[PDB]
Amino acid sequence: NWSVEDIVKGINSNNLESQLQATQAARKLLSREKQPPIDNIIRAGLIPKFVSFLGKTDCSPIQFESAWALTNIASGTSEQTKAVVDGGAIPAFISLLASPHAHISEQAVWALGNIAGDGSAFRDLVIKHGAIDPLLALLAVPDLSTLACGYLRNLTWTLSNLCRNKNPAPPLDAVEQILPTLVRLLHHNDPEVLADSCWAISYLTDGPNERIEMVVKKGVVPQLVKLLGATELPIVTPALRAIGNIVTGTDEQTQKVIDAGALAVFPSLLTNPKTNIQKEATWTMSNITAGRQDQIQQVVNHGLVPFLVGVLSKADFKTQKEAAWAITNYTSGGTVEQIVYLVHCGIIEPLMNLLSAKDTKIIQVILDAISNIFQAAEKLGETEKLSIMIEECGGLDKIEALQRHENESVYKASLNLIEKY
């Protein structure tokens, strides 16, 4: 490998081939794994030179080597990506998107993906410089399978970073302009094109209901549910995030997830061996039990209440807390027949056993749930049987000990419960 000093002596020559040799040497340094000397390359003042090499059309080799070098600089810290942008690289990379050499156009796609991935500001700056039009033009073919696999994966990933950050979210006109192509990629067969396309949809559905609706109006929910039952984990994870985001919106958007058959997949998702899949599936369930009664009923029909009892009985404490939320939402919006069915499935014992947890928020959520359950018992006139049950499993001892607690809202709800029943 060359020294930073030698790379500078060559790039500063007036010999295009001496400059090509040096730029290739710079690329090979930045493409090493151990501590790529990014900061040393920047102090040398080479970025403005690489940016200008992007424009030498009569020397394709120096365009590729400088694009590769700049791609890796822009992959580092926010300060290092800023240096690439401050050098004028953005309009230069957009121009390279139309290069007749595919490997150079691919490299420009990659570099712009790293720039837009920094955050909202650079993402919007890449969009203002007009990158979306030429990007989508690269995917305007009758069949995506005619495109090179790696070419297609870089395009999908870069598009994902143009739909990613928040505060603010990407411009509405940009999202509308990208979605038709994003939906085509969501039906492609490549696992990575699908995973990065599910991450993009995951980002666009993280926000207000106006953003959710725009995605759900393109009819991608059936396809998301299909991917939700995929064998590969990297596809199930973003597919579930998008599904979980969609159910934070209106009850009609939640209903489209139910109609696509999403609840049939949750027996597996709620017993998935991955802690993170189990937690996100439970979180999604908690937002579904917060919907209508006919929607709580559809949770019951699919046999998911026993699975919630199971997750509440044993799982990572964070998955357990999401299940506690799913029960409190279930009990607060459900009918009487639905709340007693919750007791027949055995919710009380694991719900009580979790009152020994060292977290104040879950205690409030559980106690509230118990209040909703007791309120439904008042309606059937069997408040007596339920209280014999909470006592036979040892729950009262916990409730009456919750009296002596630090927080005030716990003390009041706890006392109020032992006084009423």
């Binding site: 794994e33 791609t71 992959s75």
Partner: peptide, 6 residues
């Protein structure tokens, strides 16, 4: 977020 080419 950001990826290098090695």
């Amino acid at each position: 977020n950001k990826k290098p080419r090695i």
